[PDB]
Amino acid sequence: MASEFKKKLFWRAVVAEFLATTLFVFISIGSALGFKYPVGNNQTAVQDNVKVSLAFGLSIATLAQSVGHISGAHLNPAVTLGLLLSCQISIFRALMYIIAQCVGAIVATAILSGITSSLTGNSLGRNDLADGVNSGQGLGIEIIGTLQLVLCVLATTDRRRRDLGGSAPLAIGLSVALGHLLAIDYTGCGINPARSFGSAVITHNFSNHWIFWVGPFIGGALAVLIYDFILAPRSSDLTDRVKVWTSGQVEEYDLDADDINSRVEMKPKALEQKLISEEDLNSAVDHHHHHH
């Protein structure tokens, strides 16, 4: 049999997803490299978790931007966990989305390593514990921090109206860089399991590596219960709503005229065909077509 195009992928966005994590996370590292490069007190400039983390939330935005506001952190698995909600029978596109992005961050770090050929991996954000929360300690820290990530996504897709100011991608991200600000530094463990895993493939550990996966899943999953009431598996619509307030309209009418001046009733022709001649009716009143 012929063998040239193996796999052939499933969708043009399965790729979008690994693609997503490599673009944000790879460079994200760059911020963590300078915050430490030049290393040691040599100048007055100082880099804090605020700069690098703030750096992280924005990229996500473009992640959204390079495609359109209609896309969230396709580069994040923590946010995707909430998306699941409660659907998983036998393999799903998301099953494919989680694996693809997990892959996005991992490949990203691999390429960045060569970059460290000249420098020293002292604070690449990989297995570099930060004074404060050990990795585990991020369990509480990851749940709140990450949770914040998921809630922004659901409300972003919500049609209701309550809090709106700009574009959802920009807003959810405000949530991301920040989210990173509390969670990432406390442990160095990402808000999302993707940030922690990209670096995690490099240096493996014990249960410490597991904490990275659970804290974000607990927080987001919980987010769902927090904002997900009224269940309605597949909108079947019994018979257009189930109540009335003002008779007259059936679909969506604001007025209730009574046929006073029929303007358009008989299709003059519907989609021209040829014509070749107009009514003419003479042109005694030439007011149209002037342009000086």
Side-chain angles (χ1 to χ4, degrees), residues 3-105:
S3 307
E4 250 182 41
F5 253 73
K6 212 185 173 221
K7 223 283 188 305
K8 209 193 187 87
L9 277 73
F10 277 109
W11 269 113
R12 269 175 199 286
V14 192
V15 73
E17 247 78 299
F18 101 84
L19 268 173
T21 333
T22 336
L23 210 100
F24 145 73
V25 115
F26 169 79
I27 66 189
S28 129
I29 326 304
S31 81
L33 268 150
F35 127 86
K36 50 98 73 217
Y37 195 78
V39 72
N41 246 124
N42 279 291
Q43 312 198 77
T44 42
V46 60
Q47 297 226 61
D48 234 80
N49 220 78
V50 189
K51 334 301 144 200
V52 299
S53 294
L54 176 125
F56 299 167
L58 289 158
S59 291
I60 96 89
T62 83
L63 211 314
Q65 209 233 235
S66 97
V67 286
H69 46 275
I70 313 109
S71 220
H74 265 35
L75 78 96
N76 282 120
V79 122
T80 304
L81 279 160
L83 204 89
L84 201 90
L85 232 86
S86 52
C87 291
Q88 186 134 319
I89 292 140
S90 278
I91 315 184
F92 237 86
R93 300 124 60 73
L95 195 89
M96 246 289 184
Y97 299 167
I98 88 193
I99 180 137
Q101 295 150 244
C102 213
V103 158

Side-chain angles (χ1 to χ4, degrees), residues 93-169:
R93 300 124 60 73
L95 195 89
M96 246 289 184
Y97 299 167
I98 88 193
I99 180 137
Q101 295 150 244
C102 213
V103 158
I106 302 167
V107 182
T109 25
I111 296 279
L112 191 122
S113 210
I115 238 72
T116 321
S117 167
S118 210
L119 298 121
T120 162
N122 211 331
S123 331
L124 304 175
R126 62 108 178 281
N127 222 290
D128 164 70
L129 252 296
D131 228 61
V133 146
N134 198 58
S135 282
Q137 287 238 240
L139 178 130
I141 259 93
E142 191 146 43
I143 296 152
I144 293 152
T146 308
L147 148 58
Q148 103 186 55
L149 206 91
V150 166
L151 196 130
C152 247
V153 150
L154 232 167
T156 262
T157 338
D158 213 85
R159 201 248 166 76
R160 302 184 66 77
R161 188 146 62 77
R162 219 290 192 178
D163 244 51
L164 190 133
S167 225

